[PDB]
């Protein structure tokens, strides 16, 4: 039977990677975290204050509050069927912005433009992603040479 400590099973997670111990490179601090931003979590164990629980390491969330040194985050959690929403206060050096929406943002702006410009033309051009389709009947050249000829090889008890 297992125990109930708050850091049971974190020998490696709350552990700094190879040749990256030391002081903290401090563009981490100078970033700007406004409300409504989407954020991912990763516990740095170099500093112990305000770090979250194991269950939130690797989860993504959303901001609702802002303090002097920390941030409030809304995170979902699956516990026995039902899912719950949770409001964990977390300090800055355990977070990072997420690029999981910038792709969407490049599109809507390009897409707004590409609509408005080239609207006078009259055509409703493609605006929405499509999957990978089949592959385009085409020719193949044998610029002279006959192909190579392969065959299997005999076995050998090389070791």
């Amino acid at each position: 039977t297992n125990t109930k400590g708050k850091r049971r099973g974190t020998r490696y997670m709350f552990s700094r990677p190879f040749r990256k111990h030391g002081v903290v490179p401090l563009a981490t601090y100078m970033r700007i975290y406004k409300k409504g931003d989407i954020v991912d979590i990763k516990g740095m164990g170099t500093v112990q204050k305000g770090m979250p629980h194991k269950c939130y390491h690797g989860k993504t969330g959303r901001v609702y509050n802002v303090t002097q040194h920390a941030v409030g985050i809304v995170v979902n959690k699956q516990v026995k069927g039902k899912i719950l929403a949770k409001r964990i206060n977390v300090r800055i050096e355990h977070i990072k912005h997420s690029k999981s929406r910038d792709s969407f943002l490049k599109r809507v702006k390009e897409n707004d433009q590409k609509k408005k410009e080239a609207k006078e033309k009259g055509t409703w051009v493609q605006l929405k992603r499509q999957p990978a389709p089949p592959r385009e009947a085409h020719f193949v050249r044998t610029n002279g040479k006959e192909p190579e000829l392969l065959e299997p090889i005999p076995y050998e008890f090389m070791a």
Partner: protein, 75 residues
């Protein structure tokens, strides 16, 4: 008299039988847990937004004629 001691055998069937429902999100979430010193000013701003209403009525009225100015200049 010995027995079983722990099992999570059948449970996923039980969970999905009614479903696993994500929570119901809404707009206009709740202000439970935010900083007191910030919340305070929100009240005072809403306690005085009534002032400026006439000046607000003027600007957006003139700008409505100046919003008509598009369809004016278009037509």
């Amino acid at each position: 008299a010995k027995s079983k001691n722990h099992t999570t055998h059948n449970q996923s069937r039980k969970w999905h039988r009614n479903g696993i429902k994500k929570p119901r999100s809404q707009r206009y979430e709740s202000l439970k847990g935010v900083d007191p010193k910030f919340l305070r000013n929100m009240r005072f701003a809403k306690k005085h937004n009534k002032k400026g209403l006439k000046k607000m009525q003027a600007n957006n009225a003139k700008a409505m004629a100046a919003r008509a100015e598009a369809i004016k200049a278009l037509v």
